[model samples]
Target chain A: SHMDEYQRKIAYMYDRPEMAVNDAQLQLKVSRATTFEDAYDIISKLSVSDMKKKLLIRFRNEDGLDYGGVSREFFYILSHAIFNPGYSLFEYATDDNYGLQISPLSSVNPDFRSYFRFVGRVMGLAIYHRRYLDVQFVLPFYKRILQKPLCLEDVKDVDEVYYESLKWIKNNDVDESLCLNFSVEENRFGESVTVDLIPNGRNIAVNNQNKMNYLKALTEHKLVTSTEEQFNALKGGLNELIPDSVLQIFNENELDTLLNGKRDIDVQDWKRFTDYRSYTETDDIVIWFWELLSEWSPEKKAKLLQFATGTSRLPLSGFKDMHGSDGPRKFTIEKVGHISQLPKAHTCFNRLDIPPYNSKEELEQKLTIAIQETAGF
Target chain B: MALKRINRELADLGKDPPSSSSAGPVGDDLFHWQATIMGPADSPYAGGVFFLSIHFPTDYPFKPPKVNFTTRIYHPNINSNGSICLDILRDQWSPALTISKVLLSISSLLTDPNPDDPLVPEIAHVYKTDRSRYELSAREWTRKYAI
Candidate 1:
């Protein structure tokens, strides 16, 4: 099966005896108000070898304990905090704000280099422990982590104007009137700065004779050279948990799917992996559950998944390889409570304690409330 | 390498070409070519000959070659603008597909038009609801345009 290749890669990641030996829990006590600062303080102190241990997370001053749920929350909350645009570690690539790339100005902060390392360490922990981050980094960032070469075309996603300008230079004549050179201008902390791409680059004029050389230098400077230090720190942190050799098998797109799992949540696949405790697939309540889920929006389905499991995403191997506190657990729905009650989740088991409601309307309403409200321990 | 593949396909075409359809490089430009497809004998478009133009991209077979009808017949899938609403011409294309296979597909398309995915909805509706009128008009147009 074509899908078997993906599963085999997954088994390669999780099936190692060394991974089992490193399964001792590394606990974190974090506060919601300063999760970013707290995470940096805690994780930055641990050696790279210690970072490989299983992550066990709990919020400070809260009674909720770490099963699988608290760890998921830790990764989810910390990822959002780190990736938030206000935090300045990353910035949206486009006006649509769907994908994130590392911020060039992030280096302005004194500890930004260490923060980049901290970000990488968290990503390593997620991959090593089989947790998905809430953030969606742009494809170029993944390419950077993998040390793949960036080209003029790679500039399109992050800056369309830059890509178009490069395209125009490639296609049209480079006259002296365009006033182009082999240097790029940047705004560093509100001051304009001109960085020469090569020795005496700014003095070198871009003409039809040397435009190709200028284009190559410009693309390299804008996409790669400008961010080399930040990217090195990020890659340094990731290489600690996952050796460079292990991640080489995947390309940027494959790494994205490997990290985020498939974006389109197929209901048929979901139904296939789900198990019933006090109900059967043919049971009235069970039938109503699937019927409602089949028609629900993917966002709400994700919300329900996040409610039952700690994370919203399925594993890279799909629903069949969803993990619990142990390993490789199927999603379970056990019937419990009365018709008036709402559904509850045991994220440690990937199980949802759903009520046997009399109608689909009641089930949908109650289940919605549970997923929305059950944000804490 | 693209030129080499195009030349190889042309050689194969010359040695063992399809009976109902044929294509070759037009003049000096190997990337630009012309082709023809004789209507299938079992279809309403029978006894008509149609001409088409093909332009292979510099990265051909990797990217599907642009194909358009130069001579028009009243078919639900082929628009008056000569754009044929075919899957292989667009997203479903693969590098494994060759120009000869594409011409064969177009020849069969004349006999079996995909009415549901029509470029002209009026023709698609008539094709679905009024069979005799559809065939009669198609044949009439085939003579007026193709003959």
Candidate 2:
């Protein structure tokens, strides 16, 4: 019930009719080729108050208008690109879990602050519009956004090794042979740079007497102090739209789903909410389809979902509440096409065009190839 | 040589056996053996004996044995399919390890599961977030299936 209360509070703050007012519209003309740059240029010019308006994103030289699906696809694409390490905007945390942390080295980029700000604003807009991004931020990032205190345990999500090392330091007696200090070494620009955890930290040796203080400084530095600048800039941008006062009610996990939608797919529920044309539940083709889906790996299932739908993510309410451009639409499978043809997806309609195959083997073979190859389109 | 190694391992298990588990040839086949682990007294799995099937490769110790739980048990590291996600049972396995050590490892696993690297993440999440509930479910499964 408390969860529902927080959900309602969020709804009250974001899901308001004033969001769609004519004056509340902030239009973006972004190029697919230069999406990051174009979006940065557009949003950078807008005032902080204007950033709170409803976003209408249009791809340059494209026909489709911005609606629920276009903007959903837009956030999905741009979020992936923006968070990609090649862009130097964000980097993957040490665990390789698709959890993003601000790259300590990202300061090398001239416009890093502006880029972080833009990302935060984009994240705020996605939540407000009921769209999900393909981006996954590390747990500590959410804590920072919520202004929650980071403990030594929090480092595990970003760097498990760091967490374990800090924990060992806290729990074990400091060995004289270890030759340690209240400083951490980092490889910056191909050079080993030693940053002191505290003032005169480099000169101080770690002993059992000061080990607790050493652990505190290390945890604070590694988790919070090291990334505070980037986080503050990001929070500054996010506060323009969704303030921390409203967003702080939920914990990290709840905040994650609130931003990214539900992570797992329930195929049974998917089947229940699905409609068919010229087919029934007991149809051999449909049975074989569900069978194959049940057997396939989660990653493969996601790819198939992405192939059929525009984005891989399910809504907060899940399959039962999927919305198309025309509003609420159920996933539909229509039996059509020759044996030679692969499954076709009309993402706009949330519909799949499946071919009538003679065998389950043929269907599996064709469907796998179709989804794997046609991911982006 | 593989057969020689398998027989030697069987003799070693019979000589200095681990207190919690015992294993030997299931039939005339040296490659196939059945094992039973007495649940650790410290764990919720106590008072139950879990059956497992261990099939040595023709290459013996060079390749890890295929160990699967024949009896169902509630564990984060062991799935309903009886498959295990233990590193020592897989890539981390060494030729130096015998079936006795393997059984010992599995027995200890019943006492302390590594929820960080879990075969069943749903169960692992419970183990991580709710300790008492995980213990209760494990004890219930031990009563229902392993007894």
- Predictions in order: chain A TM-score: 0.68, 0.68
* Candidate 1: docking tier: incorrect
User: How far is A81's C-alpha from truth in model 2 (Å)?
Assistant: 1.2
Best by lDDT: 1
Off by over 4 Å in 2: A1-3, A15-24, A265-377, B1-147
- Tens-digit lDDT string for candidate 2 (B1-147): 245456677777888777768887876777679998898899999999988898775334434677888889999878677777666765465444667778878888889999545445568779988999999999999899887
Task: Show what share of the native A-B interface contacts model 1 retains.
Answer: 0.00
Q: What is the TM-score of each candidate against the true structure?
A: 0.51, 0.52
Among these predicted structures, which one has the highest TM-score?
A: 2
The lDDT per prediction is: 0.74, 0.73
Q: Candidate 2: DockQ?
A: 0.02
TM-score of chain B of 1: 0.97
Off by over 4 Å in 1: A21-23, A264-377, B1-147
Residue B40, model 1, lDDT: 93
- Candidate 1: pairs in clash: none
Native contacts retained, all candidates in order: 0.00, 0.00
| Strongest candidate by DockQ | 2
